[PDB]
């Protein structure tokens, strides 16, 4: 259809937690969604010679009652990341807001610095509206997201391994 459908199979503490299925707002933020979709299928090659892929990447920062962050496919700690458009790409638009849990939004390091890192909201995050591009939402597997929330801490550090064991487009 108009909007792409992608998924993450999540492993927590080396144990399958289930699948998260996302609906990408391809009709509102095409460039942003295409980047995420391509990173789920691993169809593009990065600047390091490896194909950009969320498979086996981890959720390095989870803060209960805030959000789950991942996508650092280069360093796995937040300092890295890479998009199919290069180290970073411009903010498409901020039409969609973080008005509810289960939203897929781009993490960044200030204006126009989107790469591969993203976060899934656990509550409404109004203070991020206009600063982070919301490009999708969870349509199935919110229980898995809640399972991940359980692994976070106020510091954000994730004591037990939260990994994406598989991913792709549906």
């Amino acid at each position: 259809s108009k909007r792409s459908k992608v998924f993450f199979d999540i492993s927590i503490d080396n144990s399958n937690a289930g699948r998260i299925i996302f609906e990408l707002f391809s009709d509102i933020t095409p460039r942003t969604c295409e980047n995420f979709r391509a990173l789920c299928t691993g169809e593009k090659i990065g600047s390091r010679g490896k194909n950009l892929h969320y498979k086996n990447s981890i959720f390095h920062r989870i803060i209960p009652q805030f959000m789950c962050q991942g996508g650092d496919i280069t360093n796995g700690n937040g300092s890295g990341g890479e998009s199919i458009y290069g180290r970073s790409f411009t903010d498409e638009n901020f039409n969609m807001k973080h008005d509810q849990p289960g939203l897929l939004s781009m993490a960044n390091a200030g204006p126009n610095t989107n790469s591969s890192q993203f976060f899934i909201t656990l509550v409404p995050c109004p203070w991020l509206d206009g600063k982070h591009v919301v490009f999708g939402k969870v349509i199935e597997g919110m229980n898995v997201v809640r399972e991940m929330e359980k692994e976070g801490a106020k510091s954000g550090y994730v004591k037990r391994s939260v990994v994406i064991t598989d991913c792709g487009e549906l």
Partner: peptide, 11 residues
């Protein structure tokens, strides 16, 4: 505080 950044995470 509560932000989602890539590299210098602040309060």
């Amino acid at each position: 505080x509560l932000l989602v950044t890539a590299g210098l995470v602040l309060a």
